[PDB]
Subunit: 341 residues, 4 copies
């Protein structure tokens, strides 16, 4: 179009609000809010997908320069703001009372939140593993929806592309900076100095606490320095990243204050914020489900739905799970290998 409403296709957009309670000559006022709220979510889901696909295209390249990294950071930050808005949309729908919802939920019988193609496309494009999902894709009767999901699982997710970018971190290379080995030998040097300082403790409980603590540190570093331990944790589902991607991620977090790593760090932080905000939506949605129809109601066949949503709050659904635990492996500033390159 050309003028405001023609450009925005308001003739199409504002003709998609059909209250089924109205067409059945028993209108329920808040059903208009129910529709509008979901359509605002679906509009922003399309925007999120559009931004995710553009970030996937920029990450599916041999090298990602400082200019392309800034663009990726901008678009990830935009997704963060849209996710906060989407979390904030819940109290607007929580304004409808359970009895008003009960008077129209009968018209929704075949419909299901599981049938949101865009919500699934978001989960898949970010990296929610099909094997890590709770049992409880085949809900989608349409063939274009099934084809859309097939492509989202087949094509590389944001998790795979970020890992590839993380593995190519300059500075990890043995030929050059050799960060991983410098980190291993400074961890050994630091942890021994901690043993020597604890040996000089005037009190025995304090000497023993420090020594027990150093042993727990030894085990923490063993989970990342022994690749067999890391690869076993990845297999269990406690980690997502490859051993080399984790090395890159750890190096980015160590040198975040350096101009060269501040932007890659921000990209990782926004990836974490996205995960955390999708989890916040899941929680607020399960609180709202509970407020409206409790753990189970007429038509639900028990607390099956409720318990499934409650189970989506687990680390099984966090894509960049590894990013939250990087500070466990941190060493003081004085102990970090200085940058030379």
């Amino acid at each position: 179009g050309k003028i405001y409403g023609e450009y925005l296709m308001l003739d199409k957009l504002l003709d998609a609000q059909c209250m089924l309670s109205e067409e059945d000559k028993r209108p329920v006022h808040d059903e208009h809010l129910f529709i509008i709220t979901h359509q605002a979510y679906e509009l922003w889901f399309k925007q999120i997908i559009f931004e995710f696909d553009s970030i996937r295209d920029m990450l599916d390249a041999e090298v990602i320069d400082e200019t392309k990294t800034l663009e990726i950071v901008k678009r990830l930050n935009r997704v963060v703001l849209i996710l906060k808005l989407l979390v904030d949309q819940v109290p607007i729908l929580e304004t409808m009372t359970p009895l008003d919802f009960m008077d129209f939920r009968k018209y929704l019988a075949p419909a299901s939140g599981f049938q949101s193609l865009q919500f699934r496309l978001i989960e898949n494009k970010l990296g929610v593993l099909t094997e890590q999902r709770v049992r409880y894709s085949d809900v989608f009767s349409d063939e274009e929806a099934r084809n859309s999901i097939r492509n989202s699982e087949k094509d590389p997710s944001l998790l795979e592309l970020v890992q590839r970018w993380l593995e190519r971190t300059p500075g990890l290379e043995e030929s050059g900076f050799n960060f991983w080995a410098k980190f291993q030998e400074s961890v050994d040097r630091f942890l021994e100095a901690q043993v020597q300082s604890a040996m000089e403790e005037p009190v025995e409980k304090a000497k023993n606490y420090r020594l027990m603590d150093i042993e727990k540190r030894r085990e923490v570093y063993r989970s990342i320095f022994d690749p067999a331990v890391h690869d076993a944790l990845v297999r269990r589902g406690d980690r997502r990243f490859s051993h080399r991607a984790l090395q890159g991620a750890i190096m980015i977090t160590f040198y975040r204050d350096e101009p060269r790593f501040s932007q890659p760090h921000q990209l990782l932080t926004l990836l974490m914020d996205i995960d955390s905000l999708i989890t916040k939506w899941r929680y607020n949605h399960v609180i709202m489900v509970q407020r409206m129809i409790g753990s189970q109601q007429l038509g639900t066949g028990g607390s099956s739905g409720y318990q499934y949503l409650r189970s989506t709050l687990s680390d099984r659904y966090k894509v960049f799970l590894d990013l939250f635990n990087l500070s466990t492996f941190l060493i003081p500033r004085e102990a970090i290998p200085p940058l030379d390159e």
Copy 2:
């Protein structure tokens, strides 16, 4: 429809996003965000209108009981939450850079924010007076849009209906409680006691300050006790309310802690919050216009647009202007006529 996407008409809704930069084979990524942002606004504008029209129907009645008042309060509070969300949508669009916007604003030449039928319908249904508007309704080329605006100006606004409800306040009546006269004579009694206390001041500057202050209080009460002064202020545009509606509003604010007036008070407060939040959107929108194209750019013909938006921030656009100044006329708790009925 029946299943999720058919119920929500996602086939229609998600087919209304046409980037003109894409159809011209010169696509600008952030134009997708520009469209989606406006469509989320337009969806919520429709919800606001739907709630406003339902509140108008409940207020266009002989008596509004405690049950219907609770429903009106709920729906006004819902509009408050939607307005906060709409204010919060601005930083999402402020994520687009001026240079990216400059690469597609050429395709928008005939379009204008003035062509938002729903934004005008919101202003009119709330009560933005046609005579109080800045010079700078005839923008709308379509006949259904012109007819929609004609009806919104003709049919009673939220301002007119609230005034009618306010005029019917029980307790204002001479036959019963006679609040206005009790308020006048307690104002006189309180202000004289203030003169007597100031007369006993040991310091002359303090006695004189108190006496100058009591004189300014006398003039404040004169603007509401002399109907000629109030009616002149309404004529100037400094007030909106009729003299009897203002009496009701003042009585509701005085006895807000009493169960009988707490709900009418909350209705008035939410009416104020709505005004204040529409003003907050106007401000954030003028800040965003400024960030994107400054006070004037190529195609604007000077700072005409900018200065008009900047002028919409004035009290000329506040519908319930009177509601913000009710605390100027307040007297201590000890001086308020006790409720009997």
Copy 3:
């Protein structure tokens, strides 16, 4: 005092910021933010306690009128707003980097979040049961702190006082409205009508699903109509409320649209919002702990602390647990016993 700084005792308040890294001639800039953030929390914790104690005094009375209920609702809503602000304070402290925190966390060795007297007083005054707490009160070395906690556990909590108020609900009484029996017999009448409608189903899978569903409804109502089942669930820790308090709570939620119950309903909703917002703070605090020092760091002696905080997210810490599940027991509007009194 009398002037601004003397009234606010800014001489005392702005002399309580002692950076231990500064006194050790190794200053860490963000330690100032660490102190200020905690002091803003402690100031608002004192305000929360002050409001909680005033609500406890109003609830520790024979009858609570409509006027005192409005005051309680106002103060509960104030606590909600302060809790949202406190949740929002986390991203301000998350602005400090893990390496900057690592350079001063050594000076905090004896200090512990467990030593916040005001946080414990908040938990106790709301109603966090001492037996429902995770093993992991005796941390407090001072005698006035131990005496403060002793009194908070001994004196009635907000949970006990709300239950007393809920038990005294007019309308529950057999002598008058007899709500519980009317609810039981309308549940029986409604559930049988649902069996008869399911019997007329043309499809067998649909008839069987409806019948399986009605059986699950029968069991839900059994948990509240058989007092032995409710009393067993209270004993297990799945419920907090007495059988009579639950009856009152259910009646308030059923007739919330009625002027008589809207205010008691709002009080219950704000009580739920408080619980939910304290849970949101706990979550954001465990995310921030994780961002700063992961699941374990030098000095922690393993993931003991982290796992304890992670366990505070369970229903074991939700005081008004029962309030979230009231919609499970809801019946359509057509099936609710009409109000007469």
Copy 4:
């Protein structure tokens, strides 16, 4: 100290809450909220000052590297988050009713918001010019407060230091990139091409509108290319920046997408966000003053105070006024001189 309360000096901090209505044996509950709210503001004002002074020290240097720029950006962003929290604190105090405030505002007679030393120190350290202030520093009776303000006006503000940093922008130099001249000659080339395109317009109203518009563009560029026009606008108070600082600011906004300028751009954006958020606090504070005591009340001596606060909303109080208008001078991407260096 060493343990939680000793480290945070909670013995001092939680002993600074003296309600004057309580000491006069006429306690007003919400006076506790009034005190706590102001003390939370004063605590965060101290944090803001601490961050501002550290940014002043980093900016008072010959060269500011990419590493020091990241630190400045981090601390400015922290101030943004604290300012949002401070804006959000207003609705918490707006929870107190005007009648409850009226029962204790008598004890505040000598106190005044003008006596907040920290609020003035914030305004001065940011750059609120003493000559640009409204008539209505000498309020401060204490000598350490007068000395604190004297030093804040004497020592360079954030506005002066940012201008110095902006003037040293590499790329502005004639010897090297010579941005200003390249910008002038590309503006001339672009504006002439616009005349030639308008000359080919089939419609005369369209040709004339385009030509009138190009003339308004010519005048816009004249205000920045003729230093006499810029220096006259600075003198009038419509601009703050020196002609060379404005050149740097314009160059940073033009090449913001380039890695070299993205961080300097972010610093400028956060400086704008700070200005805008202090303005948002001023507005919310004048709305809250109005809600509590209207435009004037007993003790105010008329609307003097109210009108002064209402006048602080003007551009006279915006420190980085110039930053909001930089998009007025923008040219399309195709017209921007390519970077070489």
